[PDB]
Amino acid sequence: MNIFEMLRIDEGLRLKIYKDTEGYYTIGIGHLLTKSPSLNAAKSELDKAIGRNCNGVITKDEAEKLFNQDVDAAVRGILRNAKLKPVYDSLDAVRRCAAINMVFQMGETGAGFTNSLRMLQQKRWDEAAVNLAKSRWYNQTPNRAKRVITTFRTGTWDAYK
Numbered sequence: 001m002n003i004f005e006m007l008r009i010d011e012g013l014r015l016k017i018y019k020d021t022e023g024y025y026t027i028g029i030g031h032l033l034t035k036s037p038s039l040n041a042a043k044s045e046l047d048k049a050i051g052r053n054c055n056g057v058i059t060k061d062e063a064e065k066l067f068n069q070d071v072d073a074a075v076r077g078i079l080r081n082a083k084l085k086p087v088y089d090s091l092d093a094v095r096r097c098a099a100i101n102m103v104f105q106m107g108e109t110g111a112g113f114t115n116s117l118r119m120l121q122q123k124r125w126d127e128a129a130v131n132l133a134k135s136r137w138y139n140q141t142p143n144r145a146k147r148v149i150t151t152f153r154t155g156t157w158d159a160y161k
């Protein structure tokens with residue numbers, strides 16, 4: 001298990017434009033295209049991302065390439081963020097995957113987790129797990145949030161096996 005396998009489980013793989021759990025146009029392994037309601041706007045973002053005229057459809061290789069870029073962007077965003085980096089650097093490798101997973105899903109802005117971050121940095125795992133669940137995130141995607149929270153609570157891959 002690694003961050004790629006973990007997010008591939010959580011996001012699935014679809015080769016044609018779809019809507020995510022929030023109703024936003026997406027493709028591949030959870031690659032957000034746009035929050036605009038315009039499918040044409042989403043198709044333009046897709047063509048820009050892939051470098052060719054895609055008509056809303058990509059190959060598996062292209063989906064995996066976008067996915068690698070997206071995971072890397074989440075990691076680099078953590079490392080550039082003065083609030084997130086110290087917490088991330090305090091974690092073991094398995095829990096770092098849970099952190100990347102959250103940033104992939106919600107972005108750096110998706111900021112309100114200050115108290116959870118403090119508990120995680122303090123290694124108060126059960127308390128952090130309780131706090132993480134008091135969130136729109138948990139209520140709207142509870143099965144995925146439960147898996148991520150179990151990963152933070154235990155430092156194991158048990159929720160994904």
Ligand SMILES: CSc1ccccc1Cl
Pocket residue numbers: 078084085087088098099100102103113117120
């Ligand atoms: C909200 S999860 C997270 C994100 C960035 C760095 C560390 C953590 Cl625990």
